[PDB]
Amino acid sequence: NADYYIGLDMGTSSAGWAVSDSEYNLIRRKGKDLWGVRQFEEAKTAAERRGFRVARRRKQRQQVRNRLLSEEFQNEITKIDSGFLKRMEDSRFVISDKRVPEKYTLFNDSGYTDVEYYNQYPTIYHLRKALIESNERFDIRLVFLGIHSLFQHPGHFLDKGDVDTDNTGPEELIQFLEDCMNELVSNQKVLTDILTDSRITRRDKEQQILEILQPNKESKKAVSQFVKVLTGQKAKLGDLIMMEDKDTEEYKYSFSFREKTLEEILPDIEGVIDGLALSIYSLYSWSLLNSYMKDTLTGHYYSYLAEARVAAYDKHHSDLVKLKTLFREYIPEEYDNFFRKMEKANYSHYIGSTEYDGEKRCRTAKAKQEDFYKSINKMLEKIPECSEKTEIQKEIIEGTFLLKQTGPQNGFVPNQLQLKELRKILQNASKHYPFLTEKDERDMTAIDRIEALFSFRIPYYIGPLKNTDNQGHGWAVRRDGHEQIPVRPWNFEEIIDESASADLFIKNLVNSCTYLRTEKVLPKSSLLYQEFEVLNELNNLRINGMYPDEIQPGLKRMIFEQCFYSGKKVTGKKLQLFLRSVLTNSSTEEFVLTGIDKDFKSSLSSYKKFCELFGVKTLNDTQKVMAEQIIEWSTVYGDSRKFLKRKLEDNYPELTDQQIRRIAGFKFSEWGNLSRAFLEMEGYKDEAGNPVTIIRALRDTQKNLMQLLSNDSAFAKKLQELNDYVTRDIWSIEPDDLDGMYLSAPVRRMIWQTFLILREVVDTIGYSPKKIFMEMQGTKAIISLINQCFPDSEVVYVKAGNTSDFRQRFDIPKSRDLNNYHHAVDAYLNIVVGNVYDTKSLRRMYDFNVQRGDQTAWVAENDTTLKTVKKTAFKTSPMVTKRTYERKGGLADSVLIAAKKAKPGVHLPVKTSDSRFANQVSTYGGYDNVKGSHFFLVEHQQKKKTIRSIENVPIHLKEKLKTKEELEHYCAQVLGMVQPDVRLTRIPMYSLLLIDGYYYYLTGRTGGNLSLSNAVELCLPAKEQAHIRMISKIAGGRSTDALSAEAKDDFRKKNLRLYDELAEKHRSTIFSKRKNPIGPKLLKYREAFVKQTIENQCKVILQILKLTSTNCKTSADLKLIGGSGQEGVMSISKLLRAEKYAEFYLICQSPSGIYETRKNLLTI
RNA sequence: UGCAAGACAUAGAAAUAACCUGGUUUGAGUGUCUUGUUAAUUGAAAAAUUAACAAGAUGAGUUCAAAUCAGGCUCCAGAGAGAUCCGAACUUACCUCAUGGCGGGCAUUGUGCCCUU
DNA sequence: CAGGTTATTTCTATGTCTTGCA
């Protein structure tokens, strides 16, 4: 019937809506003015969830790896000890709780117990040194524990190299790498020292090496490239081997050991180079692996990492004895408080172990290194300066004092070093135990499989192997006929189709076209797409204000043919040269180029590349399809060239090996933004009868993509026909529609709540809005939704500053600290400003009448409409509705608290299905801060009196507690309640509760009491709002220095009157009905309020205002006046009796606020 | 002037993976000497060791194991076995299951009021 | 419950050369 507009202001925390007519007076239905504010907490990103998910998947893979290793050692372990694995698996439990009653986790056997196993080998790194540097037949358990530690500390997996390169020493390697060919030994110490010094970067190493080797003549560039290969940079072959025809591509290949390994670079250079593949040869790997394992004591690098961290252990012992000597003298008193007491940041805290006198070991959290160093420095202050004190302080500054072995600093260990250690362990133990040599069906050897499990890391493209379709996060495509069989190393290629899995990964990631939303996009390097870019750029190119083909027909074709076939970057000067060459006429050649930025940003690189690939000049259709598929495979597979090589060999047999090598050397990286079908869509028939396409239209005519998609173009009609438009029902937008467009979670919640308000308003009103005014990233998402549900409505974008200019110029103050109405006033102002600006200096636009056609927007005469907006601007009508949500999050803290601190019931046990951790939280610790999801109202009997209680449902029990019977059972057993009768099964967090005539927001729980926040917005006149704005500005960092004495007096008096108004609002108005009012405390504390200075007065005013706001916990820091920082807190007992409470209502509010149900908790 | 489609450059982020260092809890790495009290086996008694306490003194210390959201999935019962992936993100007013209802209306400075169920 | 690394894709600001709509 009538015509109405809806205005919308979205914020990450609040969403405000308003509805108006052409006269800017609000539509009101159900007797309620249709404008309000919906608040919701800022949504949380999936970063923490993703981190925890990858962490738990990593843990699961570690578990299966350890189980496999245990199964491989099980036969010999059981031969020597029946239950070693069970003792390993029952390490947490006390002696009684173990499956078998024993005392210590490892080496239970009599004689060789744990107490002297740790005496023989103080650490694991003492055992591994013994394993790799000895031949004596070791117990299978010792080898198992060494390999177990190696598995539990794998290493970087970031470097490329070979383990065996460390067997040959630096001297022998230098001898083998000194003048290998006919085109160093003396300086075999400084070079190695520079190479193995991690302090200097690669560039510094290269500069020092070039400075110190003093290269011979005629090899300066060759020696520079050799140094680049040595330290590791992208260096071409070039003069390394010195062929004359350097211009050839085979001798211009660039390779760096950082980007690729030797076995991967070799195929790219096999056959091309002379000799037995030759120039650094397996000496950079030695430098990388031996850089970390230096000693700086004898100058000789350690062979294996276990040889280090034993010398570090000895250095720790020497430093500890030095500090003990330095402490026993000069400080006989703080000996007990530092080396035995479990105080803060001392040695016992640095380790987490102490034994004062006979008492049990006190194991606590390990103190950080920084705190321990600070404590050592503080306790060294009492010691007068001496040699030992200076040396200790120098070591502390150097950071190599009292070092531990396992810590945050162990991130430098490469997997190759640990692999070498494992290989040595397995070779030493292989000469005695024969089970480590026996073969398998797949020709394994019981040693190669352990190494495989050590080294097999699932590639990033494969992702998780199994998916039960509970949620879509796996791509691993399994071979036909291969299912329900576990994925391990040595059968990854036989179970997961790696090529198909990578293809699925890339096509799932890649996005759809910007014009055809159902078909996927072409690779950027694809011939069609590159030709599209070049043709577009030629179309935009204009010469002296004329079209490129307007100068003479065939100019654009000539440029596309004879200027781009080279495939290189076409610059402006090259185009000028071509224009001079091809144009016989036009002697003057000062042709000004417009439409390009002096360089053609696109070039037919792929066309030329495939032209040299096939030798022919111009490709045909079959060769074009061949090249298109080759480019698609190279782009999808990317850095993994093995997939491309396999596809080429199994699909295109006519290609030669040199051609395959050339294909593998191409650089096809990124994806485009236009689909394949969009470029070849059949816009119309031509005169000859052949089809025309968008790409062919660019080729022939003089137009770009946007011109080809004009309103009258046949391509536009074909686009509308192909992109079928369905006006989906307003009531069919599930919140998964906005899950495709790449939006952050806060924006997603913004969009969903705002659209819910829109849907409720439109349904209630009856018909779609004529205009929907909205602010100017994620807002565009709702645009789509509007265009998917309300085709008639047109969105009138409003500038961000226009509304604020209206507020300042026409005197409508906004009070961001007072109440939440400013969102609704912002939406209504969006309506009134956007309507005027859509109808039409910037201020002058509001100085006269604005009217277009039959619709009148602004009437300056008598300010009639203006009066209306002002009468609406200050109205306290808006509805404030907080989102009622179940508190989704964690079950409890992710880190277990100590047993001596945990208490039963309040703390979640470690594992509530074992009957061991559940009833023994005081012994095995537990999880703290067990959060709850939602509240429920249950009627029970206490002291033979019928009373009702609101109680919590914890998050870890939400799924099993959503019906009346289940909640009754939960109250009956877990909460120890007699005769429960659950009356309300869902009271979400942040819900409107009417208690004793005052509105509350149920926002948590503190033990036996439930916590509430203020739900009544406080309204004050305009002058008070301006004063509060000044208060907020001054309390933010401004000063009173510029203010005059009269200004100070006026500020003091107006502050006093604002305080009086606030005090009265807490006494005579609704705020007096709150539980534990602050009015008496406001009046009692008023005496000291005047004596306070201006700035602290502003602070206490803002803190007082914090009591009457719905966006913060009701608490004030009135310490500047004399009260505590928790003044005016609201919390009421969870027991609802019939005496203390007059009306205990729950106001279930619809998201728009139009619909609401009041449930009487007392008598439901 | 806004919107948004194409190309380049400069700064970024986020979503999925893969991995590392770990961190937390628990448990293991026998603590040892003197003094006295208490309780034991003796012993008229003396004395005697043993064991738990309350003081004083002294030695060692670097590591390992298990989990690492509660849980969930499958199989035939349980302080199990399989799998190594689902679980900390987005969505949830209320009523009884439809593109339903959540009454007809007046205010909006203190949570009300008229007219019918 | 914190600090790092690797890969892919997408998105966002700003500037540059164009083009079309409301």
Render A1094-1143 in DSSP notation, one character per residue. HHHHHHHHHHHHGGG-TTS-S-B--TTTTS-TTBT--EEESEE-TTT-S-
- In terms of Cα–Cα distance, which of A724, A681, A689, A669 is closest to A705? A681
Sign of the CA dihedral A581, A586, A588, A593? negative
Domain shared by A611 and A600, yes or no: yes
Q: Distance between alpha carbon A1074 and the CA centroid of its chain, in Å?
A: 43
Distance A146 CA to C15 C1' (A): 59
Quote the DSSP letter at residue A907.
S
Domain shared by A859 and A910, yes or no: no
| Alpha-carbon span A399 to A980, nearest angstrom | 64
**A1079, A1072 Cβ separation under 8 angstroms:** yes
Specify if A575 maps to a domain: yes
User: Which nucleotide does the CA of A1017 lie closest to, via C1'?
Assistant: B110
CB atoms within 10 A of CB A787: 14
The pairing of strands A593-594 and A32-33 is: unpaired
Specify if A539 maps to a domain: yes
Specify if A738 maps to a domain: yes
Q: Which ranges constitute the DSSP H helices of A974-1076?
A: 1022-1035, 1045-1065
| Alpha-carbon span A1144 to A998, nearest angstrom | 10
The pairing of strands A1144-1149 and A992-995 is: antiparallel
Quote the DSSP letter at residue A216.
P
Sign of the CA dihedral A90, A91, A97, A103? positive
Resolution (angstroms) stands at 3.5
Sign of the CA dihedral A108, A112, A113, A119? negative
SS3 state of residue A955: helix
Distance A61 CA to B24 C1' (A): 20
- Which secondary-structure segment (H or E) carries A1106? none
Sheet arrangement for strand A945-954: A981-987, A932-942, A945-954, A1135-1136
- Chain C positions within 7 A of any protein Cβ atom are 1-13, 16-22
Distance A414 CA to B18 C1' (A): 16
- In terms of Cα–Cα distance, which of A428, A508, A432 is closest to A463? A508
State which residue has its Cα closest to the C1' atom of B67: A92
Nucleic chain B contacts, protein chain A, residues 321-350, CB cut-off 7 A:
321, 324, 328, 335-336, 339-340, 347-348
SS3 state of residue A1012: strand
Determine whether A9 is an active site residue.
yes
User: Which nucleotide does the CA of A670 lie closest to, via C1'?
Assistant: C9
The total number of residues written for chain A in this structure:
1164
State which residue has its Cα closest to the C1' atom of B90: A745
Domain shared by A550 and A692, yes or no: yes
Sign of the CA dihedral A137, A139, A144, A146? negative
Quote the DSSP letter at residue A42.
P
Quote the DSSP letter at residue A596.
S
Cβ of A36 near strand B (distance < 7 A): no
| Alpha-carbon span A683 to A714, nearest angstrom | 5
Sheet arrangement for strand A992-995: A1131-1133, A1009-1014, A998-1006, A992-995, A1144-1149, A1156-1160
User: Which residues are A37's β-sheet partners?
Assistant: A16, A880
Domain shared by A125 and A179, yes or no: no
| Alpha-carbon span A455 to A415, nearest angstrom | 8
The CA-atom distances, in angstroms, between A658 and each of A612, A627, A664 are 12, 16, 10
* Residue type present at position A1126: Q
User: Which nucleotide does the CA of A119 lie closest to, via C1'?
Assistant: B29
- In terms of Cα–Cα distance, which of A66, A269, A255 is closest to A153? A66
Domain shared by A821 and A923, yes or no: no
Nucleic chain B contacts, protein chain A, residues 57-96, CB cut-off 7 A:
57-64, 66-67, 88-89, 91-94, 96
Specify if A508 maps to a domain: no
| Alpha-carbon span A513 to A518, nearest angstrom | 7
Nucleic chain B contacts, protein chain A, residues 634-673, CB cut-off 7 A:
672-673
Specify if A87 maps to a domain: no
CB atoms within 10 A of CB A280: 21
* Residue type present at position A566: S
| Alpha-carbon span A34 to A1065, nearest angstrom | 27
* Residue type present at position A974: V
Cβ of A367 near strand B (distance < 7 A): no
Q: Distance between alpha carbon A468 and the CA centroid of its chain, in Å?
A: 25
Tokens of A911: 């594992």
Distance A1157 CA to B102 C1' (A): 8
Specify if A424 maps to a domain: yes
Cβ of A779 near strand C (distance < 7 A): no
Domain shared by A699 and A804, yes or no: no
The pairing of strands A992-995 and A1156-1160 is: unpaired
**A761, A1152 Cβ separation under 8 angstroms:** yes
Sign of the CA dihedral A131, A137, A139, A144? positive
Burial of A127 (0-12, 13-18, 19+ CB in 10 A): buried
**A835, A828 Cβ separation under 8 angstroms:** no
Specify if A649 maps to a domain: yes
| Alpha-carbon span A1111 to A1108, nearest angstrom | 9
CB atoms within 10 A of CB A67: 12
The CA-atom distances, in angstroms, between A475 and each of A181, A497, A641 are 50, 10, 20
- Geometric angle at alpha carbon A1130, from A1125 and A1136, rounded to 5°: 155
Residue in the block written with tokens 């606030």? A1062
- In terms of Cα–Cα distance, which of A149, A122, A20 is closest to A413? A149
The 3 state secondary structure assigned to A57-103 is HHHHHHHHHHHHHHHHHHHHHHHHCCCHHHHHHCCCCCCCCCCCCCC
Domain shared by A176 and A146, yes or no: no
| Alpha-carbon span A1020 to A913, nearest angstrom | 57
Quote the DSSP letter at residue A26.
P
Query: What are the backbone angles phi and psi of residue A1073, rounded to the nearest 5°?
Result: -80, -5
The 3 state secondary structure assigned to A365-403 is CCCCHHHHHHHHHHHHCCCCCCHHHHHHHHHHHHCCCCC
| Alpha-carbon span A656 to A762, nearest angstrom | 67
For residue A742, the domain's CATH number is: 3.30.420.10
Domain shared by A250 and A328, yes or no: no
Going through A490-602 in order, the beta strands assigned E by DSSP cover 521-523, 542-543, 593-594
**A534, A600 Cβ separation under 8 angstroms:** yes
* Residue type present at position A404: K
- Geometric angle at alpha carbon A226, from A665 and A295, rounded to 5°: 115
The pairing of strands A4-10 and A771-775 is: parallel
- In terms of Cα–Cα distance, which of A403, A198, A412, A170 is closest to A303? A170
Domain shared by A574 and A649, yes or no: yes
The pairing of strands A879-882 and A35-39 is: parallel
Quote the DSSP letter at residue A179.
S
Cβ of A519 near strand B (distance < 7 A): no
Cβ of A490 near strand B (distance < 7 A): no
| Alpha-carbon span A524 to A528, nearest angstrom | 9
- Kindly calculate the radius of gyration of chain A based on its CA atoms and give it in whole angstroms: 39
| Alpha-carbon span A379 to A1133, nearest angstrom | 50
Domain shared by A704 and A731, yes or no: no
| Alpha-carbon span A406 to A423, nearest angstrom | 22
**A383, A330 Cβ separation under 8 angstroms:** yes
Q: For A500, what's the count of Cα atoms within 13 Å in the CB-facing half-sphere?
A: 12
Going through A200-317 in order, the beta strands assigned E by DSSP cover 235-236, 254-255
User: Which residues are A685's β-sheet partners?
Assistant: A691
User: Which nucleotide does the CA of A542 lie closest to, via C1'?
Assistant: C18
- In terms of Cα–Cα distance, which of A377, A401, A378, A382 is closest to A332? A382
Tokens of A340: 């035995």
**What are the contacts of A309-315 at 24+ separation with CB within 8 A?**
A309/A123, A309/A125, A309/A405, A310/A123, A310/A125, A310/A126, A310/A129, A312/A403, A312/A405, A313/A122, A313/A123, A313/A125, A313/A126, A313/A405, A315/A400, A315/A403
Burial of A637 (0-12, 13-18, 19+ CB in 10 A): buried
Domain shared by A131 and A203, yes or no: no
- In terms of residue numbers, what domain contains A901? 892-930
User: Which residues are A521's β-sheet partners?
Assistant: A675
Cβ of A545 near strand C (distance < 7 A): no
Number of domains making up chain A: 7
Tokens of A200: 């200097």
Quote the DSSP letter at residue A977.
-
| Alpha-carbon span A128 to A121, nearest angstrom | 9
State which residue has its Cα closest to the C1' atom of B14: A744
Q: One of A9, A166, A497, A737 is an active-site residue; which one?
A: A9
Tokens of A692: 């025309």
Cβ of A111 near strand B (distance < 7 A): no
User: Which residues are A1160's β-sheet partners?
Assistant: A1145
Specify if A141 maps to a domain: yes
Q: Distance between alpha carbon A359 and the CA centroid of its chain, in Å?
A: 47
Cβ of A447 near strand B (distance < 7 A): no
Query: What are the backbone angles phi and psi of residue A335, rounded to the nearest 5°?
Result: -65, -45
The CA-atom distances, in angstroms, between A982 and each of A337, A845, A951, A965 are 57, 62, 10, 8
Domain shared by A35 and A58, yes or no: no
- Chain B positions within 7 A of any protein Cβ atom are 2-8, 14-33, 56-73, 79-80, 82-94, 99-100, 102-113
User: Which nucleotide does the CA of A521 lie closest to, via C1'?
Assistant: C9
Tokens of A215: 């290269």
